[PDB]
């Protein structure tokens, strides 16, 4: 029972249909079937670039565009707003995602119903009363937190509970995805807007080709009741998307606006799916033109940093561990330094599944207060492994801090550790991310990055209204304090058959956050000849 | 019967309506004055209770609270429940919770001016203003000592000494002070006040009167300034009972202090028969520090919709748990006002002009170091079995609370010209005033500052036909402006909320009978009012308008040498003419019908010579409890008695021992509500045994 590649389907990467930067191509019918109708089959995707660089997808990635404000005049009113934009990819540093070609529009527009789509979440709340804290009602309504700070609780029966079928996830297999897009940059941390859907309006998402728009507008006729709204929409990842009459006027009191994506400098040109005979059963794997996997096509597999601390203090982009067309590991692009690229060996004419598979559920809400790693989990089982990131709960888009958990819990002066999700209902969507990973002894292998550009907005640059400083020491001049963070999950080989999981955060202008671990059913089977 | 020729003869002359000493018949607006004799007769706790029997003013809106002299005159108040009181023609310019309050014992005359009178007093509320003239020194040696011992442990000791330093009376002084110490009606709250007003007057001749006016007041504990829910005060609690009238929802360590140090003068000088100059200035350094936990309606209130403490309650118990909030405020207000007037009394043929040209400068700086406890900041109070616990205010949790540090700067320079042209009997009072009102506000928490410089011109044209018999019909259109303190979606302060009024009425003030019957029918509109945003935002917007058509009848008449009837009536049809959420609604705390009637009989012949048994009953009609008009506060009729017997018959001439019983029937009534969460219980029956000795 050796790990071999039975089928290998390659294709080019087109740029038509207004893609611009999304190098896309329809997956082969066999690859489409194995990605949607046969999720439990470990197929390795390899991206070949215009420079000859070869890279294998390994690990998830994320990008948020959170923007929160808490203006309040204790005699007149109080207003809140939280506009997040979660875009995720199927590769650690590339922007790899799947979409259905049947959707009408350009290639970025086609992504509105595929993965790599900016899942925007909005919560506009407020009240015209004396010493009202209805600024924090949007956080209570949008985020399903047990509790961490102080304020209001909005029951799930009242507020908006997004169905799990309405949020696309890179590696979602229950959907129909017959095309794949790969962009040389990272996930689009599209930062725009500060408020959820506007009540007394239609609630339509004006600005980008949105889809799956869900709104819950609480607009009672009583003028002395805290009105709020919650909105979710899947929109264009390359365009500013906002709710009607709630655009971002780009003031100095509101931070910048932009579709942030840190380019690695490489341009994809070919995609190859290596259909291994590894079938994932749920607690490991079982063995079911013919290529074999070894540790002579050397394909870059992952990165192996000596220490989890990137030491960048901000958006810490990891370079893509590529391999030139001369069988030599290298790293292209990236901000973090010191990484070592590890390469698999694929050849056509024999590593075998080692008995014993370890699995863990990365559950918990680790509260961060500055750049520093933490041991967030362990795996109970050479450093050659095959890993599947099974998301049993739709909290992957709640992973990452600041605008993804509840940007009103930072006010509390204690360790929150509160279960603050995004209110995503059910888990009726198969979310699986198969990947082969090399784990050098002692070195840390990242497999999940949550690079996030956030702004603590101030709405008004006026002395009457005091903006609430959520994740900053203060808001001098009532200007939006742009922040950055690069929450990264590292998989390290301890050497005693214990694959420890380390989460490292790299903040900038952010005092701290809560990073809800995304309930990943991490399943590792060590393979070695 | 000192108030006899004082409420009907000495009350005819007033200097608030036209800023010149003219009879109220020659003032083309509704103006009511109460002389110091009426103040001594009624012995009010504040100026509000002194203005109980004057039409157009709702003085009992806050109930038992005596914290501020907040008057809803003609259905209109200042910006954000602020004060619009003037002391010596100079505004007691207070901001936020720092509002100046002057004890009625320490005033010689309180002239309430109704309607837009911004033509002389700068920015002002459209309803009007209150002018509380200080007790100027008297040339006749007066040494008065007064003791007020009453219910609620009220032990007020006061004195009033005035004497002429020299034989000719050139140097005269008046050192009047008091020291009151009473427990508020609400159980736990105490009201203390220590006020002193040393006054010095210099009179070189009968032309110049330079009187130095100061007023130092220290209130270690102001009293109760909290809110109560409509569910327990107006409406019965879910068990069927009601909140007791002595219910204090604050913490066991509620604190509310005030400290006023006002120093100024009132300078008068008559050059000739055609040129007399006046100048009043006053620097007031007001400090207030409050640690108050105020109720915010029961947990079933729409405002406390989610309110986690309320949410965790059982659904049946959310209707009687009072969700509250706390405020920790500390201020220091340095107010400076100057009002220089030049009154040129000249004639042009037959017409006799009194051309008042003046310059008025008012400057207020108010720093605020306040911390506000937002929703879910203090534990809920179980109204069934309330427990008073020492809520610490230093534990300022930023999750449910936030600082309010701001430096409110306000400045205003006003140049006004007023011409009281009297031809035959057609007195045409035409005035105008240009105000350069500037306002700054530095949010010290963030650092932002916003500035607005308003140049608003207001004018008043009134015509009075003084008939020989005594009835003087008058009509007048008077303008007002009052700049807003709020900013819009753009962060810019709004335009001033201008106020227009067309008032028609008569003032039967005969020169022979002691009757001051007054009527007035007005159409007072406050344009440019701030309403909720038409779109889905919680900011404010211009364009709102509150219009109030009313009819006011006042009757001050000494029917006989003993009887003295001082009544009033007020119909107020206030309404939001233009609004987004309250269009057509009647403003809260504005009763449609207000009536009052004070009759006192002073025995002069017989075994009971000296008694002043006077019974007065103030009626307040039903008022809407919130701007949304969801509920109406019931109408109440409070009856105040008075048994005063001077001691001249005993031998101590001038000394009188009185017994004032406010709310004689001890009616348990909710005074008013500005919203479903804020309601104020009315003052219970209160006897006050006053003994003012002219030692
Ligand atoms: C002979 C006939 C009568 C003739 C009468 C003629 C009078 C005419 C006066 C007109 C001008 C005026 O209005 O005069 C006022 C009132 C003074 C009393 C008046 C007489 C009353 C009674 C009159 C007499 C009755 C009979 C001054 C004032 O109000 N001052 C208060 C001040 O705030 C106002 C300031 O800004 C304004 O302009 P803004 O910048 O805001 O725009 C002013 N400009 C104007 O008005 C111009 C105006 O528009 C032009 C138009 C004029 C019209 C004239 C026409 C009419 C003429 C008529 C003829 C400016 O005045 C001046 O510039 C001087 C001059 O104008 C006055 C001189 C003459 C009068 C005195 C003699 C008295 C006359 C002689 C009497 C014997 C002033 O300085 O804050 C101080 C505290 O500061 C701090 C502290 O650290 O805590 C720090 C500070 O920070 C800062 C900071 O910001 O400063 C910044 C930091 O970076 C850092 O640098 C930090 C630094 O470290 C710090 O050094 O400073 C800040 O944080 C604050 C915080 O806000 C807390 O609130 O706190 C207070 O101290 P406190 O509270 O701690 O003690 C202080 O109160 C105290 O002084 C007041 C003390 O009362 C007593 O003495 C009264 C005694 C009376 C006698 C008793 C009876 C006798 C028997």
Numbering used by the authors:
A (entry chain B): 41 to 328, 355 to 361, 374 to 427, 456 to 487, 494 to 641
B (entry chain A): 20 to 714
Reproduce passages from the article.
Here, we visualize, for the model phage T5, how host recognition and SE can be achieved via the interaction of different phage proteins with the same receptor in the Escherichia coli outer membrane. The receptor for phage T5 was identified as the outer membrane (OM) TonB-dependent transporter (TBDT) FhuA almost 50 y ago. To elucidate the mechanism of SE via potential TBDT structure modulation, we report here the cryo-EM structure of the FhuA–pb5 complex and the X-ray crystal structure of the FhuA–Llp complex. Our structures show that the phage lipoprotein Llp exploits the known allostery in the plug of FhuA in the opposite direction as during ferrichrome import (i.e., from the periplasmic side to the extracellular side).
We succeeded in solving the FhuA–pb5 structure via cryo-EM, using complex purified in decylmaltopyranoside at ∼3.1 Å resolution. The FhuA–Pb5 structure shows that pb5 is an elongated molecule with one end inserted into the extracellular lumen of the FhuA barrel and with its long axis approximately perpendicular to the OM plane. Pb5 inserts four loops (numbered L1 to L4 from the N terminus) into the extracellular lumen of FhuA. With the exception of EL1-EL3, all FhuA loops contact pb5, resulting in a large interface area of ∼2140 Å2 as analyzed via PISA. Pb5 completely fills the extracellular lumen of FhuA and occludes the ferrichrome binding site, explaining why addition of purified pb5 to E. coli inhibits growth under iron-starved conditions. Interestingly, pb5 binding does not cause conformational changes in the TonB box, and the structure of the plug in FhuA–pb5 is identical to that in apo FhuA, despite the fact that ferrichrome and pb5 both contact Phe115 and Tyr116 of the plug. The LPS molecule that is present in FhuA X-ray crystal structures is clearly visible in the cryo-EM map. Interestingly, the region at the other end of pb5 that most likely interacts with pb4 is poorly ordered but present in the cryo-EM density and only visible at low contours. Combined with data placing pb5 at the very tip of the central tail fiber, and the loss of tail tips when detergent-purified FhuA is incubated with T5 (13), we propose that the disorder observed in the pb4-interacting part of pb5 is caused by FhuA binding and leads to the dissociation of the tail tip. To our knowledge, our structural data for FhuA–pb5 provide the most direct evidence to date for the view that DNA transfer does not occur via the FhuA channel, as originally proposed based on single-channel electrophysiology.
